[PDB]
Design a protein around this nucleic acid. Structure first.
Lengths: 82, 109, 93, 97, 98, 82, 109, 93
DNA sequence: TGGAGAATCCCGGTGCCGAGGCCGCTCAATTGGTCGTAGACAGCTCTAGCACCGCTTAAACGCACGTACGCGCTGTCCCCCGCGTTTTAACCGCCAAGGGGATTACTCCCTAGTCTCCAGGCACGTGTCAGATATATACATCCTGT
DNA sequence: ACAGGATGTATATATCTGACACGTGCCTGGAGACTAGGGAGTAATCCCCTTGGCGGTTAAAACGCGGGGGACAGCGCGTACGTGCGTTTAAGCGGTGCTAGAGCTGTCTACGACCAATTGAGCGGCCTCGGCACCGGGATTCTCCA
């Protein structure tokens, strides 16, 4: 059983992401908001991925399931099969 | 005493296949019947688009002093254009990156 | 097991445009995905267009109208010209 | 000793990270987070090697775009620092709320 | 002296009044003329059914109302009460239409 | 030939639309922006409507063409056939 | 010496038609073959959704002291709910109107 | 010329829920459009789902998975229960 | 306005692993002929879209006045950035075991196709009642002076 | 902090009218009863790739401290937008007339589906070399303080 893994997204990584986004100064309350947003996004994608996997009577999640789940929500991805 | 064979692509003067496109159309649950002129049209359109994108990517790759094409060059070619950026408006390219730009307010003075 | 792709034709077109320039595998995968996506879009639009008018055949007119509906600006014009020329050349021979 | 004024290293980092095309998050914590989240929907699951990579790519692209919109919203109000109100407004206008 | 209201009361009264009803807020003949003039460019000598214009007007009004709501939110975010073109531009740019 | 019909969208109508939107105070430069936005929207819809009409070899624009054109852009409409 | 007739809806205990749904499925270019249990499932789902929306609209109409349903009541019923508002997120209802709300900053004090 | 709609069944359901309540024509048109839209969505999703797994038949499992994919929250649960009960009752008789 | 100093750029030499080209073969595209129906073309009918005229009145337009709001300037203080140390866990090789994802052959039950026939659903009248429109009344709210 | 006058709004009552709910006749599409063939379910085998453990090394994360610049509140001046009144202008409504184009039959032909025989294009496996990644040293540029 795994627990308390959301804290592995350290603040230097968030700072790097903000730098690539083009941000210069950051307040001290951004990190909790970022973690919550990321968790919501991941839950939304993974539910559909698992549903696709379960329809085919398998026990392993493949890349095509993720591609289909992403495509169904309007975010097409190029590079991983498909 | 048959007359050998000639691919339909050679008759149409194309590079993309025609028989494969016809087979794909006939087994895709699109309509009951398929005409004899649709595959030529579709193949021509696909070839034209491919040529456009490849030319732009090759120009970018030569500008960067390289002799091979990598996803960064494709990303640059697509995003710097207008019509192509309109077409691929909601597509993510792996290992692509972003265009460099900084808001003018943040610059020192 | 046999698997199909568009690698050969993409390479031929690339050799036509830039005579001396290579390409890696990841870019090839991206190009394959792009071709498949465009094919699917055009085919679906043509199917719906044929269904609206109570017909049971897909012809060149459906493809042309779908191309006009999908592509923006000059791309539609050039694509229409190319397709018309290809069909006209094919019919003669 | 030698010191830089506040704001120079930030611009240097902005240019440096806008020039490259790599991943900016460690891999093992992300994999552990993915497995922990997937635990709830079904038990005793297994993952291919490339599914995690696809998930990470999508997540990073999404976050970068959101941060860009947040920066625009922050600038609109005559400020330079970004604050949670900007994220909330950007998400609400976009239609995700 | 005659009777006058403070600036801002009639605005709120109108807000309530127009949020209570479900009618159309634009005259019909100018809209029809505008539609025909715009359609002139794509093809000449066209004719319209009676209900197409109504559908177009419905869609246009819904779109405009939603845009104005988003503009008001953007205006409030910057500690103001009056809406200005910058708010419309920002709302359209964030939404993805630009 | 018709011309100069965009001026038929008077400012009282824009004020009524803003009132239904929930706005209290309005600047003096909103009307030109509103007119431009409306023109762009109408052009975008009407082009596809006319294309749909022309494919069927007709000379009259029907409501179903407008419904299809609106649906193709992600704005579904209920009430006019369909 | 036939045994009269019985509609499949009566066997399934439904109100929506089953044969019409089966015919619509078989002539829509969805798949080569259609099973014998899909129409019952689809009809049940459609009937359930219709009943939900109608109940909410009728409650609103009675609350407004009327005995008939008009598009305003449907708009109110859809927008006041959560799941239904999520489902019909990008749909416009003609002659509907909007929900009444005013930002608290604009109120007098 | 014959034209088909869902008016009778909607009226029957309405009489089941609220015994004494009417409805106008515009609301009927809106309800018809709603039913058609939901039908189209579910059918298309099921068709794509069947195509992914290399099958040529549409069964109850495809419909159930499509319903789970489309509807949010408790609506999916209640719809699944209703469909399962209906199929079970139909098979017995 | 000048120096010091730190960060970036340019150039030459090594080596390795991924991209490009060749060969065998097998399965999918081409050639030749038959047949039945989907769609093209001609003709006719009746609906609905377009144009014109007169009248009553509701909405658009122009002007004057005054007040509340947008905008610039100043000052105080706290919170975020830049840099040096110490501690923690990611990353890279290597090995070992087994679960589960792909194939193949066999058989049987479920779905498509055909003919007969007979009720459910659609188009067409008819009447009555729910809702729209005046009219008088009473209650609620705003604003200036006290 | 209240008193009271003026204006906007919800309530109860009485008269029309046209849109909705119901009944009748007829026809076409759904149900009942068979046959024939192939799609999918089941059992057995093979081998790949996913999970788990161990040891060493250095890159990245965590912590503390000193300043400086940016977020935020308060004050003042000026102008542009809201409210109300009198005059001008097209929108809306009710008729009349005319004809273009949408919609529905009937006949016929040529085009696409289907089948059998034949062969060559494209896929998998294999070698080989050069394009790019890495390392080291020198040259150029930008920032900060007197």
């Amino acid at each position: 059983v795994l627990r308390d893994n959301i804290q592995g997204i350290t603040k230097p990584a968030i700072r790097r992401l903000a730098r690539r986004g083009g941000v210069k100064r950051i307040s001290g309350l951004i990190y909790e908001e970022t973690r919550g947003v990321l968790k919501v996004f991941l839950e939304n994608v993974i539910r559909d991925a698992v549903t696709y996997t379960e329809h085919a009577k398998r026990k392993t999640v493949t890349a095509m399931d993720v591609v289909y789940a992403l495509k169904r929500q309007g975010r097409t991805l190029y590079g991983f099969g498909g | 005493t048959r007359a050998k064979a000639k691919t339909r692509s050679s008759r149409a003067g194309l590079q993309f296949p025609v028989g494969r496109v016809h087979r794909l159309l006939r087994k895709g649950n699109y309509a009951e019947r398929v005409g004899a002129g649709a595959p030529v049209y579709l193949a021509a359109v696909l070839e034209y688009l491919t040529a456009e994108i490849l030319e732009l990517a090759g120009n970018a790759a030569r500008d960067n002093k390289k002799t091979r094409i990598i996803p960064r060059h494709l990303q640059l070619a697509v995003r710097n254009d207008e019509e192509l950026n309109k077409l691929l408006g909601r597509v993510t390219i792996a290992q692509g990156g972003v265009l460099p730009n900084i808001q003018s307010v943040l610059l020192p003075k | 097991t046999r698997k199909e792709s568009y690698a050969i034709y993409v390479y031929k077109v690339l050799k036509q445009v830039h005579p001396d320039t290579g390409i890696s595998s990841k870019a090839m995968s991206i190009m394959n995905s792009f071709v498949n996506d465009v094919f699917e879009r055009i085919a679906g639009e043509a199917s719906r267009l044929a269904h609206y008018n109570k017909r049971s055949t897909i012809t060149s007119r459906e493809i042309q109208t779908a191309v006009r509906l999908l592509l923006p600006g000059e791309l539609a014009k050039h694509a229409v010209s190319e397709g018309t020329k290809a069909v006209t050349k094919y019919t003669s021979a | 000793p030698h010191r830089y004024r506040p704001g120079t290293v930030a611009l240097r980092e902005i240019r440096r990270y806008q020039k490259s095309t790599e991943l900016l998050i460690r891999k093992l914590p992300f994999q552990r987070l993915v497995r922990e989240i997937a635990q709830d929907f079904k038990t005793d699951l297994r993952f291919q090697s490339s599914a995690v990579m696809a998930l990470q790519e999508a997540s990073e692209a999404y976050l970068v775009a959101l941060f860009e919109d947040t920066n625009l919203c922050a600038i609109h109000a005559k400020r330079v620092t970004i604050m949670p109100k900007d994220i909330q407004l950007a998400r609400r206008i976009r239609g995700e709320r």
